[PDB]
Amino acid sequence: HMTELLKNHVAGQWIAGTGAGITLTDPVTGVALVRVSSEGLDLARAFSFAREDGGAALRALTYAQRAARLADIVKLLQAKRGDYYAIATANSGTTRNDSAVDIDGGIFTLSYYAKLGASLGEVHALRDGSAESLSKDRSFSAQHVLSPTRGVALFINAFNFPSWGLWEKAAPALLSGVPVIVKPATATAWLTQRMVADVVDAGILPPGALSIICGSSAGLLDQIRSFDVVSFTGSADTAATLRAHPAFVQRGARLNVEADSLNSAILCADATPDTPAFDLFIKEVVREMTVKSGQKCTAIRRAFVPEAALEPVLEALKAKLAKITVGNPRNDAVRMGSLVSREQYENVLAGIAALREEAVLAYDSSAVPLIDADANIAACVAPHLFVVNDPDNATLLHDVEVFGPVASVAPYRVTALPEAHAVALARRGQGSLVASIYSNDDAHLGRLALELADSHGRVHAISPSVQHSQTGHGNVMPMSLHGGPGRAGGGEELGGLRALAFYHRRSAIQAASAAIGTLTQATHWPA
Amino acid sequence: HMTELLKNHVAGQWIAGTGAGITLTDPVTGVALVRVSSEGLDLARAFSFAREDGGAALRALTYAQRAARLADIVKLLQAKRGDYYAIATANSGTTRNDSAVDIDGGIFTLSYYAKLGASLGEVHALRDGSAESLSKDRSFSAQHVLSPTRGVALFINAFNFPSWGLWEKAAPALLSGVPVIVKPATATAWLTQRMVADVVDAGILPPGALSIICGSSAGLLDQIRSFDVVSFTGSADTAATLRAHPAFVQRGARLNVEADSLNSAILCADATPDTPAFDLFIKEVVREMTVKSGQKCTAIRRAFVPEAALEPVLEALKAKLAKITVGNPRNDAVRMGSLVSREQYENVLAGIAALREEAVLAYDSSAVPLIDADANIAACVAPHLFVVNDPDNATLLHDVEVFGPVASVAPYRVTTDTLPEAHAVALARRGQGSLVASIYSNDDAHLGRLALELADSHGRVHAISPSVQHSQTGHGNVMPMSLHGGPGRAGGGEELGGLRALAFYHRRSAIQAASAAIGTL
Ligand SMILES: NC(=O)C1=CN([C@@H]2O[C@H](COP(=O)(O)OP(=O)(O)OC[C@H]3O[C@@H](n4cnc5c(N)ncnc54)[C@H](OP(=O)(O)O)[C@@H]3O)[C@@H](O)[C@H]2O)C=CC1
Numbered sequence A: 001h002m003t004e005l006l007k008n009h010v011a012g013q014w015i016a017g018t019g020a021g022i023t024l025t026d027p028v029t030g031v032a033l034v035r036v037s038s039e040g041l042d043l044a045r046a047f048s049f050a051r052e053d054g055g056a057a058l059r060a061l062t063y064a065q066r067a068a069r070l071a072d073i074v075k076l077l078q079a080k081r082g083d084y085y086a087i088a089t090a091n092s093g094t095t096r097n098d099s100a101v102d103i104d105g106g107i108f109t110l111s112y113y114a115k116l117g118a119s120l121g122e123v124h125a126l127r128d129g130s131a132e133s134l135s136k137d138r139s140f141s142a143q144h145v146l147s148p149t150r151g152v153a154l155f156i157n158a159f160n161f162p163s164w165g166l167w168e169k170a171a172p173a174l175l176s177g178v179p180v181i182v183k184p185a186t187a188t189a190w191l192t193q194r195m196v197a198d199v200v201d202a203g204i205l206p207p208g209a210l211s212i213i214c215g216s217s218a219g220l221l222d223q224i225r226s227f228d229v230v231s232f233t234g235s236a237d238t239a240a241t242l243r244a245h246p247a248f249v250q251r252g253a254r255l256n257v258e259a260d261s262l263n264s265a266i267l268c269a270d271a272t273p274d275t276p277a278f279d280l281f282i283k284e285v286v287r288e289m290t291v292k293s294g295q296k297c298t299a300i301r302r303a304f305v306p307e308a309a310l311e312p313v314l315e316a317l318k319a320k321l322a323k324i325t326v327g328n329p330r331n332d333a334v335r336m337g338s339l340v341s342r343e344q345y346e347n348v349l350a351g352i353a354a355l356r357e358e359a360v361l362a363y364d365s366s367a368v369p370l371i372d373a374d375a376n377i378a379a380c381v382a383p384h385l386f387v388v389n390d391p392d393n394a395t396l397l398h399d400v401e402v403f404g405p406v407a408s409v410a411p412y413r414v415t416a417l418p419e420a421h422a423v424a425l426a427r428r429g430q431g432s433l434v435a436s437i438y439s440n441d442d443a444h445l446g447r448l449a450l451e452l453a454d455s456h457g458r459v460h461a462i463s464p465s466v467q468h469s470q471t472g473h474g475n476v477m478p479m480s481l482h483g484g485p486g487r488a489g490g491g492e493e494l495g496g497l498r499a500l501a502f503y504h505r506r507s508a509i510q511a512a513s514a515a516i517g518t519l520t521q522a523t524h525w526p527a
Numbered sequence B: 001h002m003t004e005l006l007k008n009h010v011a012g013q014w015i016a017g018t019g020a021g022i023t024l025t026d027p028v029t030g031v032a033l034v035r036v037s038s039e040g041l042d043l044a045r046a047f048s049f050a051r052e053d054g055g056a057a058l059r060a061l062t063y064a065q066r067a068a069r070l071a072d073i074v075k076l077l078q079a080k081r082g083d084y085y086a087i088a089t090a091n092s093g094t095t096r097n098d099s100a101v102d103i104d105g106g107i108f109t110l111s112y113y114a115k116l117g118a119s120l121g122e123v124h125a126l127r128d129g130s131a132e133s134l135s136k137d138r139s140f141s142a143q144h145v146l147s148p149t150r151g152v153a154l155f156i157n158a159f160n161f162p163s164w165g166l167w168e169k170a171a172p173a174l175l176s177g178v179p180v181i182v183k184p185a186t187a188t189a190w191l192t193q194r195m196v197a198d199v200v201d202a203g204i205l206p207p208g209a210l211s212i213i214c215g216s217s218a219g220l221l222d223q224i225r226s227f228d229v230v231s232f233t234g235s236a237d238t239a240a241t242l243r244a245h246p247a248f249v250q251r252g253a254r255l256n257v258e259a260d261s262l263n264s265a266i267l268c269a270d271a272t273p274d275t276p277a278f279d280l281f282i283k284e285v286v287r288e289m290t291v292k293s294g295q296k297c298t299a300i301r302r303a304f305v306p307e308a309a310l311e312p313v314l315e316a317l318k319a320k321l322a323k324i325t326v327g328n329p330r331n332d333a334v335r336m337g338s339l340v341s342r343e344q345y346e347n348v349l350a351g352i353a354a355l356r357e358e359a360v361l362a363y364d365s366s367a368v369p370l371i372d373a374d375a376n377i378a379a380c381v382a383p384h385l386f387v388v389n390d391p392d393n394a395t396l397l398h399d400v401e402v403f404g405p406v407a408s409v410a411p412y413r414v415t416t417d418t419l420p421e422a423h424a425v426a427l428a429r430r431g432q433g434s435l436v437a438s439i440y441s442n443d444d445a446h447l448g449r450l451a452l453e454l455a456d457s458h459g460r461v462h463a464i465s466p467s468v469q470h471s472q473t474g475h476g477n478v479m480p481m482s483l484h485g486g487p488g489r490a491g492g493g494e495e496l497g498g499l500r501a502l503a504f505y506h507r508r509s510a511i512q513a514a515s516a517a518i519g520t521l
């Protein structure tokens, strides 16, 4: 007898893939959990049923009606959190607090869109801006609208957020009336599949609105057509491979990418060791290094501090990192669990060795015995902190990402903005999801933030006045844009209402006033 | 021995390409006009100077300051229109009225962005939407902003609009603080090069802000990097080649495509021959087939009419098309000039022959003697009107584009149950995504409803009715305050739409901070 083979949901039916499948395992205990397989699926019908029946069914509803369905899904997921936490513990090896980012982060994001969606109203098209006169006598005018794309939304998701990656994307997709096919990363696919199964079993959404495929991705892009959209999250390397596909190069399907990002944290010149902003910086660096063992795309990887502050920074980080206990998330004493897999454990350790060739290791608690875990079975890596004294000439600092509990600190020469050098150094990341900045002076934060804006999708400013209210460097608030230029993928997600454009076509309607009036009665946009 | 070799403007200097270059010719008279060449240019330097020197200089200026420079260009271009019209006549073979679409359309568009830009004020970044609270006590908030991309804008432009294609794109790009490298299509590059030369000569913009390269495209995409943007206008085939390039696939540069589009015109059930809307439809179809000899990306290619209206439609189109005189644009009696080149003449004739395999030729004035032009020299194609009786089983109708004075009429089945035009909407959709559909009715309210039905497959829906006979801006004319582009076959691109055009040239970022810091940007 073998572990459960998880079924796919395609063309409105639960269908097992054929063969022995791929086993998912517990990254702490090594226990075999479940299996996945996409072998032998009818991908043509999987895509046609979603596109035709799923799409027609969703578009038949208004925005408000679809939002009401999202609100029902929220209630359902909320009721089954107990099941989800147990899966997260086993499949991902994350502490309860860290699992919560995925599970409760996911639910929060979905609820936010349910609430926002109600404000889109009882219509089948959205109003983009206002009418513009095209005539001296105002007889002829233009009004832009958004209409749902007559395609499917294919989500190729990363291993780190099986729950949040699904709902962050599915909420604006379904709100926009676009049917979803999700393809979660294999290693941690279990939570994704269970959530989809719960939602599908509940019959909240019409048949074809939500489908799931786990296992091999072979054949998926071959089914993508010109009105479909694809949202990919993962490595820059994989993203480039996807971009070459005929689905995009020949058929022009939309593709959003979130990829590698060496996110920066900048300690401002005024934030000296004696000031409150200093402590906030130390706290934020440690949090981002350790939450999910640093396995967030937005985690701080590069921390830039004034030359004068380098030694006190390292000392403070060492002291705080020392309190981070590592091991089995089932133990209450554990502050940080495992990476997602032994494979990731290997990648991360190789990355640490690579960085070490060009950087000094200031902190490494590898020798500390794991709590309730066997170091030889678990995918636990202890926090590692590097120092790069010459970031201008550094060969790896600005280029090599270690997707684990690892970051590098580098001094900058204080100067124009005092932080001008740090801004240039951040820019060397070649485009990032987020930069955070730390100062005692709220009047200083704006100018610095604008200097970072063209190279960072989000700039997150932490200061004493917001010690209790700031929402976290790495946490993605759904009302704010997520994504970044250059290496980070050039993508955009979330940002509240901004998320809808990806799922719509914008059209200019030019017509007599009375025609603009009648088309306008059939649209809505929030005040 | 020898026509003028036009110089490129790269890295702030005028540099001739090497070799004999490529000759541009008058498509009516066959006269050699000028030559272009990009041979031996230092492309690395051209792109670095634009990105670094040009980009830094533009970004140092505020939106309003850049808008003010745009306004100066407008005045300059206006003062030199006489030069531009003579070039358009010779190089493009277009009538004065058709040349005006390119020249005065270009100027209008630039001036529109100059005005829009003045309103943006003395700032270096734009607010996107309003500030939003991220905490119960409102101490922590978020404001989205737009910042200019630290790259260059490369425009690979189509032959049809050397002026408008330039200013179309260059206006929002320069307003956004992004340096421009224009690469106009060879055959008609002269007007583009002259406009760029006049602007450069005048020193309105900083060195590096505006560059031009004419001749071979070899090596251009190789210079494109991750913060650059590229705007291509032309064939789907070429677009597909561009999309495959490492500049986009590996380095992730932005690419906007506007490509082949089988734009529809739909005659509504109510628009019978005895109604004023019927003549508006006839007039618009004829205008779109003949303006620039049908060489607009937006021209009507497929005209869908109720089964009952088909014969009156064909007869009315025949009568109107008969009035369209063809020949030398220098002659004031000529209503329609030449295609842009003898090569295009052959391409269009091939296209006509292809369509004829599956369609009946209802009108063809090929044998009507040209005015002041030699049929063996000139690239004059006469209007051709096809009829496809069964558009449901038609292959070529919905797929094959002829970039000339050529369209196809087809009947639709009116729906008598509960829109009358349902079948026509389905037929328009068969074009697989288009720039524009026009719709024609006596009933303004009905048009609003029908428009919404066409919106997901057309970038623009343009409704013509008696109430706007005098004010409607034309099926094919691209008003800069409205979005230009379309889904699917049309390329999935978006241009213009007033301030909407700026997004392409900026990065949007969420700033989350203490509310005080948010308030003052
Ligand atoms: N040196 C390294 O290896 C480094 C890795 N990373 C991290 O690797 C993580 C991704 O895990 P993954 O295998 O390892 O990497 P990729 O980014 O593929 O992972 C993203 C998703 O794409 C899917 N995918 C992968 N290849 C293809 C393909 N050819 N066609 C269609 N879909 C595909 C994967 O599915 P499935 O998982 O089922 O294979 C995965 O779920 C990323 O989150 C990234 O941050 C970060 C830094 C360095």
Ligand SMILES: NC(=O)C1=CN([C@@H]2O[C@H](COP(=O)(O)OP(=O)(O)OC[C@H]3O[C@@H](n4cnc5c(N)ncnc54)[C@H](OP(=O)(O)O)[C@@H]3O)[C@@H](O)[C@H]2O)C=CC1
Residues within 6 Å of the ligand: B156, B157, B158, B159, B183, B184, B185, B186, B215, B216, B217, B218, B220, B221, B233, B234, B235, B236, B237, B238, B241, B242, B260, B347, B348, B351, B403
């Ligand atoms: N069956 C037919 O007759 C068809 C005709 N067409 C017509 O084709 C017209 C456009 O073609 P036409 O101008 O001759 O020229 P083509 O599209 O070949 O080329 C147009 C522009 O794109 C450039 N280009 C081509 N390949 C690349 C590349 N790999 N990298 C960078 N730039 C490149 C060309 O540069 P360069 O100077 O180096 O060539 C030129 O500047 C369309 O407007 C349409 O009317 C479209 C489809 C079918």
